[PDB]
């Protein structure tokens, strides 16, 4: 656990910005096609954060070409190139799973 704490901390990113459930976030992700390495953006609402050191994760919900999509990002994965907060949301809960049953005008989050 001390042993594991040292193995974990040496892989942890130092640059991860403060964000919060209900924030809109843009995550830049590496994608590979052969030997060609693009960066793909995934913008959406943060519906859940797992704070768990190196195992930290966060879930982003986006409506994309008329289809709800959630990505669970592993925060310290090198696949996640950058995270940036586009808009600060005002919610009360830690987890916004109630957004899954809400579309359009019902799904709006007040700014913080």
């Amino acid at each position: 656990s001390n042993i594991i704490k040292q193995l974990e901390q040496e892989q942890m990113k130092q640059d991860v910005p403060s964000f919060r459930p209900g924030d809109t976030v843009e995550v830049k992700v590496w994608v590979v096609e052969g030997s060609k390495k693009r960066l793909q953006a995934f913008e959406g609402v943060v519906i859940a954060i797992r704070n768990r050191g190196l195992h930290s994760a966060f879930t982003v919900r986006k409506i994309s070409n008329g289809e709800g999509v959630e990505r669970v990002f592993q925060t310290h994965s090198p696949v996640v190139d950058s995270i940036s907060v586009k808009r600060r949301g005002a919610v009360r809960k830690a987890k916004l799973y109630y957004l899954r049953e809400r579309t359009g005008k019902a799904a709006r989050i007040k700014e913080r």
Binding site: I4, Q6, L7, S77, P78
Partner: protein
């Protein structure tokens, strides 16, 4: 070759630069101290006994202590044997370190599985449950028939029934060595290995090639 005795520290992951997350068991392998060398003359087979770790001086018995005194090693928490292959040679008192595994690609890891106590046939043997409803009377997770009739008029040995499950020696074979850290006395192997955190593990180079 020989293996080494280690302790299951727990699990983590190693993120690779190319994006992959590798689940790892972290095995603490402190020095294994040779406590006896079995010879073909005196013992009828070739092997080393090793100890690792430390025992309380007051909880090491006089028989145990005298055995370690002959070796000239500090008492460890136990004694384990490893069969020597032809050509392998070790001396009493020799410390063997995790560096042994430095050029080993795969290992087999042996430990004592977590103890589930008395397990039913559903859990222990993956028996199918019977109907939850449709009239079933008191026979939801019970094993069903355990034999035929007058012929043979008995239950066959090895019949799968409820009983103690887990808390037994298990070997998982052919786990990739992800890292050998001699400085920290660590071996990282890919994937899960038997036993609880804190439990002893025997790590040997993989027998399947």
């Amino acid at each position: 070759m020989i293996g080494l005795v280690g302790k299951k520290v727990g699990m983590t992951r190693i993120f690779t630069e190319d994006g992959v997350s590798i689940p790892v068991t972290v095995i603490e392998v402190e020095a294994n101290r040779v406590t006896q060398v079995k010879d073909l003359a005196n013992d009828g087979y070739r092997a080393i006994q090793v100890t690792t770790g430390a025992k309380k001086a007051n909880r090491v018995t006089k028989p145990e202590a005298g055995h370690f005194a002959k070796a000239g090693v500090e008492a460890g928490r136990g004694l384990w044997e490893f069969r020597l292959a032809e050509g392998e040679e070790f001396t009493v008192g020799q410390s063997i370190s995790v560096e042994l595994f430095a050029d080993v690609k795969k290992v087999d890891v042996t430990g004592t599985s977590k103890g589930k106590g008395f397990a039913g046939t559903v859990k222990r043997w993956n028996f199918r449950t019977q109907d939850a409803t449709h009239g079933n009377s008191l026979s939801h997770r019970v094993p069903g028939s355990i034999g035929q009739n007058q012929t043979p008029g008995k239950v066959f040995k090895g019949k799968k029934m409820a009983g103690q499950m887990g808390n037994e020696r298990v070997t998982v074979q052919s786990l990739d060595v992800v890292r050998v850290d001699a400085e920290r006395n660590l071996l990282l192997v890919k994937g899960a290995v038997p036993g609880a955190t804190g439990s002893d593990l025997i790590v040997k180079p993989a027998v399947k090639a």
